[PDB]
Amino acid sequence: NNTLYFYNWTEYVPPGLLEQFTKETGIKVIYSTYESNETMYAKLKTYKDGAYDLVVPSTYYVDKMRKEGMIQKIDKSKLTNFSNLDPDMLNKPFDPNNDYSIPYIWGATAIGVNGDAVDPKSVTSWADLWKPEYKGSLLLTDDAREVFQMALRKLGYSGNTTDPKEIEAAYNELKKLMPNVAAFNSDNPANPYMEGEVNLGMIWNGSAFVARQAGTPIDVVWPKEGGIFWMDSLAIPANAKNKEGALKLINFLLRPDVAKQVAETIGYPTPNLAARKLLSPEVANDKTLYPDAETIKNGEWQNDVGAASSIYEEYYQKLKAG
Secondary structure: OEEEEEEEEOOOOOOOHHHHHHHHHOEEEEEEEEOOHHHHHHHHOOOOOOOOOEEOOEHHHHHHHHHHOOEOOOOOOOOOOHHHEOHHHOOOOOOOOOOOOEEEEEEEEEEEEEOOOOOOOOOOOHHHHHOHHHOOOEEEOOOHHHHHHHHHHHOOOOOOOOOHHHHHHHHHHHHHOHHHEEEEOOOOOHHHHHHOOOOEEEEEHHHHHHHHOOOOOEEEEOOOOOOEEEEEEEEOEOOOOOHHHHHHHHHHHHOHHHHHHHHHHHOOOOOEOOOOOOOOHHHHOOOOOOOOHHHHHHOEEOOOOHHHHHHHHHHHHHHHHO
16 A cells, blocks of 8 residues: 565575565555665765665664765654663764664674584684685675675774775785685675685674574684674665654664564574563573674674775775776
């Protein structure tokens, strides 16, 4: 009866959701996926094929979009399930009062290892991926900031640096890893491991879950230097034709049964606290999904770099060329 345009990352909405929403609301949602923020960005500033009413950027893209005037304000008064959000995902300084973004799903990037093929006790750090022996067998997520952060951490620098010298040094190191790289995948990184065309590499903790779920000896190792933490937030584009509907779609995503239902299917963790008490105990206590306080303490959240995004972005495409 109404139509809504939703652009989101690839494995987050499982078959059955959007339809459920439609049963309830009578709103028809035209769904579209993207595999990276860089992608989603270059699109929103050019076309319609992508999405207009609802998009989902990483919190590190929120200030930059907000500034370009790309996303508008969210009336959270119409978002009555907002109170279910864990308060530790709300004081963030890129949107202190959550007027432009709504926590949706969080996760981590770490080392995925093919059990029945490689000994998980043998890989312990990001540093190990540079060993000559992993030649032509590594999977890398197709994310500039995640690839830099892994090399940046291997060197002892912050993954949120804004120092071109540091970045450049990571670039240099990233060049040594080139022979080891079999693929770049931001679609569903578990896939190549399951197809078994890669032994070890980077892995999102949620897609390794859906893969185990299907019987793949995919083990997740927290690296000695960190683990890359990130969060995806719902935002409403400035040129949205249906912001009223977008706020419905958001409150739907905030009802605890919904979030509960998706998190058990896609494994990525929910910042929805209500929905967390509802989670089966095999999921809620899986430390590769809801890692302990000492482990987030040792990893680092991907944050805004500002104008320096220019350097990561360019230096990454060079890499993907070279």
